[PDB]
Design an enzyme around this catalytic site. Sequence first.
Site, PDB file in Angstrom:
ATOM      1  N   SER A 122       5.876   3.541  36.581  1.00 18.00           N
ATOM      2  CA  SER A 122       5.384   5.193  36.280  1.00 18.00           C
ATOM      3  C   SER A 122       5.684   6.265  37.399  1.00 18.00           C
ATOM      4  CB  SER A 122       4.077   5.544  35.636  1.00 18.00           C
ATOM      5  OG  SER A 122       3.079   5.202  36.589  1.00 18.00           O
ATOM      6  N   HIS A 131       4.798   2.714  29.479  1.00 17.90           N
ATOM      7  CA  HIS A 131       5.609   4.029  29.579  1.00 17.90           C
ATOM      8  C   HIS A 131       6.883   3.824  28.672  1.00 17.90           C
ATOM      9  CE1 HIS A 131       3.094   6.335  32.033  1.00 17.90           C
ATOM     10  NE2 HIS A 131       2.448   5.267  32.728  1.00 17.90           N
ATOM     11  N   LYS A 136      -0.250   7.055  25.379  1.00 13.40           N
ATOM     12  CA  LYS A 136       0.742   7.577  25.957  1.00 13.40           C
ATOM     13  C   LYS A 136       1.749   8.102  24.544  1.00 13.40           C
ATOM     14  CE  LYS A 136       0.161   4.835  29.805  1.00 13.40           C
ATOM     15  NZ  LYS A 136      -0.822   3.608  29.264  1.00 13.40           N
TER      16      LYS A 136
END
Lengths: 394, 394
Positions: free
Chosen positions: B184, B212, B243
């Site tokens: 990230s 991610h 997320k």
Amino acid sequence: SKGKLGEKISQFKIVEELKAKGLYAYFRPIQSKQDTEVKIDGRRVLMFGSNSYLGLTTDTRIIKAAQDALEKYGTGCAGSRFLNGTLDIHVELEEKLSAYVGKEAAILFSTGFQSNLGPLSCLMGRNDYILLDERDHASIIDGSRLSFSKVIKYGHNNMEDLRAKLSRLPEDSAKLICTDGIFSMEGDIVNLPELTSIANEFDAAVMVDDAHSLGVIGHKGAGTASHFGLNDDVDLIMGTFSKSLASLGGFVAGDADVIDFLKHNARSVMFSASMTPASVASTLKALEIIQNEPEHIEKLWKNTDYAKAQLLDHGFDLGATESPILPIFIRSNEKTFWVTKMLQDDGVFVNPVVSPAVPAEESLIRFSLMATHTYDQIDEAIEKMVKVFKQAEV
Amino acid sequence: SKGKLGEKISQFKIVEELKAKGLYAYFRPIQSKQDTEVKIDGRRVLMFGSNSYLGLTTDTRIIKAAQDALEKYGTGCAGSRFLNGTLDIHVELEEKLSAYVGKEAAILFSTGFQSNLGPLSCLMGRNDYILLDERDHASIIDGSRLSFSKVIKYGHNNMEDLRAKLSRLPEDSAKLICTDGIFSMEGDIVNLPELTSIANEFDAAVMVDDAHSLGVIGHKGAGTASHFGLNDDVDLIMGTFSKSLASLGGFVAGDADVIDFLKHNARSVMFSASMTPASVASTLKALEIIQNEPEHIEKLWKNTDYAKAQLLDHGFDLGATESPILPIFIRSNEKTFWVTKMLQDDGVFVNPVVSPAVPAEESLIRFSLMATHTYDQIDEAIEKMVKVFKQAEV
Ligand SMILES: Cc1ncc(COP(=O)(O)O)c(CN[C@H](C(=O)O)[C@@H](C)O)c1O
Ligand SMILES: Cc1ncc(COP(=O)(O)O)c(CN[C@H](C(=O)O)[C@@H](C)O)c1O
């Protein structure tokens, strides 16, 4: 690649053996609300294995608060508190918890488990010490292992051992003592008066984990320091939202300077997404109900006192509980698995404690009360527990 | 007691200095849904600092699914999955995630963070080794520190260093390699083809953290193994729900035997309360939307490609991203704090990366896209970022 990995898991046979014997009773999929009865495979089962001490996961006001927060704030915050993951309602819940336990400030975490990882990992460092009761919750040992400090266990509620071990340490080192408030395996209470007297003599920080204490002991349920009058001798009050408070998450409360350091230095809050709006709102509403409606705590204790008396009267062997956790000794892992499964099949949910968590001879089932239990439900479960203990030859 | 504890926190001055300079921009209380604009202190702010890559925390279908699960199941499960905390819907979400990432089985955890603690703490033991990319997420290092194994870091995406370090280890030891999929801080992708080629040569287990990556790369967003075609060379696919999936929680997916071992041996699932019903339902509905409606991923990438081109065209210095994370180098901690605060005050939310996470000279702001961003919002934010970088003399 899986050759060595397959070898690492090869010796773990107990689950396949429990399943093949028809004794496996774990991961049962409940089909309903967590309540005094639950639905499993379409049938009804009395629940005496819950941490929902006040029965609040079914309170329509708390359900509606959570649904309203979904409506306003959506399903998630999608970031860490220090960046894009703080809501006004997180801050509100921190201010309300600080008031409830009588501390300057609080910081939420997304689980109780991560609430212990935070302060235990980042306050004591190299050349410092963490002192743990040997029966402390797994998250406390794990939090302490994430520190760069030396972790020392002391005997269970053994103040002579704590004092002796503190006495051996260099004066020029920081020390922190971390204890459960109520210990969940036997339901016993920490000797907080003597622990804090020792902490004061050695200038050790004190942290209490009140997972099982909030909503249970203390004035209006405010926990273990409150129960003993020792707020001013406890540096950090940790709690969870997953038990009385009917939700998910936890907190650490204490002096503003310490809490400011944690909220910027604890990896378990810097590097993990914040509590969902729904869980913040349900915790806020549960906290308001626990304080404003004294009947929940009172009946929890009416049920606890009734069930404990009834168990002792039927000749069950109980552990040294001071809480709504009634530990019932069986003292054989095989009987404990058998009793647990036969009770589940007969409509009663209790929780087993077996090796390697405990010695075979201390294996037990935990029977926990909720404010919402009726005396009839308690009587039905004890009638069935007498029958199954008869069949199992305990 | 607080004497030594006060000394332990005494040197931590950066927050008091940021606050007194009027530069403090952390823990801002948002008053609205996480969305392309958020409300802070009553005003509107463009959000370019979120992990909600698909914009789904505002999807009314996902909000309603969560509200319906509150209605049916209440606010919390109040126990561990293995005891009284499993719902039918937890099992449903495990089966659906297993299908999505192409593995036999999965186990949920109540956070992404605890999803890494589980397998990293309990698979490798004494005399075994865990190999970590040095830029791995904090929860991976912490999970590995909770093992009884020797933890070895290798250089960032440095396959020669990984191979060399594996080469030094005893043959008679188990090894596990754990990597982020998308990292990230710079938004770069692991060299999974070479990492898995090395893992196969040394019979090392492979675990990929797709926090991610899920909803971002891979077929229908199924992650990093899917992106490279390497499902059969990856033992464990870990993901989070905080997320793209718009919720809270995570999972580990893999072979049934390995997953059965984890779900009974990982402390972060044995000793922590299960995901709330609302979060299970929101994750289930988000997962159904990501697969059934390809437009979310496609526009995430249309926005990413547009914003990256626009940033490079305006002469911003970007990091080696391959994702919707656009790292913008500033290379001064003081300028990074100043730019972050001036942008927030001017209506743009970005995330700073500063010492001690990075060297001063690599300090940067992270500008992240969401599928729901418009090109007009991107243009407004870049116009304001050009103005503030001008004022800051970057
Ligand atoms: C690669 C990776 N793995 C695991 C996690 C933990 O997953 P969580 O518990 O669901 O947050 C994150 C969190 N990343 C963000 C971060 O570290 O800033 C966090 C806020 O979600 C992550 O980036
Ligand atoms: C004393 C204590 N501290 C911390 C925790 C972690 O808090 P959680 O993350 O909110 O679960 C628990 C969990 N006790 C239960 C247990 O370990 O069985 C768990 C299921 O809630 C606990 O008993």
